[model samples]
Target: SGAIYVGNYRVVNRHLATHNDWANLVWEDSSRDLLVSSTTAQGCDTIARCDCQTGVYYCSSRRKHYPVSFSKPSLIFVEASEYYPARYQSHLMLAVGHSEPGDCGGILRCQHGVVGIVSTGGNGLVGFADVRDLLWLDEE
Candidate 1:
């Protein structure tokens, strides 16, 4: 089982919008909601926040280890309205990712998969890469 990290953040700005109307959702509080689809095979995770207006999500990892990424730059999916659940009065559907099978590193394969929720800024969403366009790892 994995542990879900949930928190609230506000929207700051809008980022790259995708084919979907809600793909690039950036909050003022530096929270974001995006998508990551598989390239060649199935099994993928579209990470999202539990709260949108106020960025909040439930994140977790069963292996007792934090989320990890692969060598390959996975496809980043955009959030679409169709994905939104009707139950919630206001909120976006959660996104998820899958790790490459037979890969013990857990989504560390240069294939299809997503890492997890991360912080970019205190205003809105930002690209996956850091200031230098590099993968930003969570602090343990």
Candidate 2:
């Protein structure tokens, strides 16, 4: 759950423009592991943990929106995604939350990733957290 500091890495912000209307982050572990976190109000927000060494991943989803489908709760829009830097290494998880009679819960799954359509959105507000094992991944 840490971010990387590329330290003034030159990026052409205008070279390509797209809109996902979400916040996302990607980082690597001491073991050269990669972690990705992405969120959306229209979709799911995810923080994925990967053991790039083995091509295995575990994802956590935080549902904070409504349904993208009918009969589903509004929270169904919350989703998560997992990706591998290798060939076809990306997966998204769609989840839902129930808020009736004061109830709330969520679920995670493997699905397609988001594609940028319009040329407007990413403002890079995500801060880099070159975090060490300050937190635990033992319970995933």
Candidate 3:
């Protein structure tokens, strides 16, 4: 089961902004493929390299947060976002990146296309929402 699977990114920080919190795209390289970048975080903002290839991206030498051997964990996203509240735990995942305030509304892409969105993060782990569970929402 590995292809273009869609879903929402997640969590939250100080501000609750969902006005521009939806990314329908992804990125890939030698390191990892991640959801597109929006607001979510700046430290927070991001790095966008192009590959156009496909693979389950993890923290490589380029993106070293954990380790090269550690490729079995929550699919790391770029930013973190939230549509509702943080009190209710949704289909969320954590990424390996530095986050800042207003780090909500970022995209999490991988070889499987996009995996989640930006909710929030502080240190090195960013919380993102799996967009697969958010197919019920109708955007206009």
Candidate 4:
């Protein structure tokens, strides 16, 4: 969400809750796509865009594993002041996060739960999308 690099006046406008806020998707894929799973957000791809801070993932198995130290930092949510799908809303997968494209498809997590997968990127900011609300799809 740090578009400050452009200029002091420039900004990343991803509303808190709007139309372009999220992309629609299916619960089927999320539940199985990545073997390293968590409580999948099988509904809408929550557009969570942020600056490149650090790397957070597992080493081997896909379970609850986050060991922090002076070298590593815990995943924490701060002021995501940018244009995001968390603004609009949708189980709809449209793709978010804009930073350094070409390299895509990866599972990102701050906690033990699944954060999101890769799609694409641009400007050193990746908007592949933050798929958390992929739930409430067919919760029957």
The Cα local distance difference test for each model comes to 0.23, 0.20, 0.35, 0.28
Candidate 1 lDDT by residue in tens digits, 1-140: 12112122111112222343234322211123232211222322332312122222222223333233212222333333332322221111222333221112121111222233331211222213111111221111
For 74-135, candidate 3 gives per-residue lDDT tens digits of 43434323433324333445545654434344445553344444454566655554443323
Model 1 misplacement above 4 A: 1-31, 34-63, 70-75, 78-140
Stretches of candidate 2 off by over 4 Å are 1-23, 30-32, 41-140
Q: Could you tell me how far off, in angstroms, the CA of residue 103 lies in candidate 3 after the best superposition?
A: 2.8
State the lDDT of candidate 2 residue by residue for 22-114, as single tens digits.
124322231212333333222232232421111111111222432231121111111122211222211222222222211111111113221
- Show where candidate 3 strays beyond 4 Å: 1-88, 135-140
Cα deviation in Å at residue 91, candidate 3?
1.0
In model 3, how large is the Cα lDDT of residue 51? Answer: 26
Among all windows of 10 consecutive residues in model 1, the one with the lowest summed lDDT is 131-140
Cα deviation of 37 in candidate 3 (Å)? 20
Error of 3 at 71 (Å): 10
Candidate with the larger TM-score of 2 and 4: 4
* Highest TM-score scorer: 3
The TM-scores, one per candidate, come to: 0.19, 0.15, 0.37, 0.29
Count clashes in each candidate, considering only residues at least 3 apart in sequence or on different chains. 32, 10, 26, 39
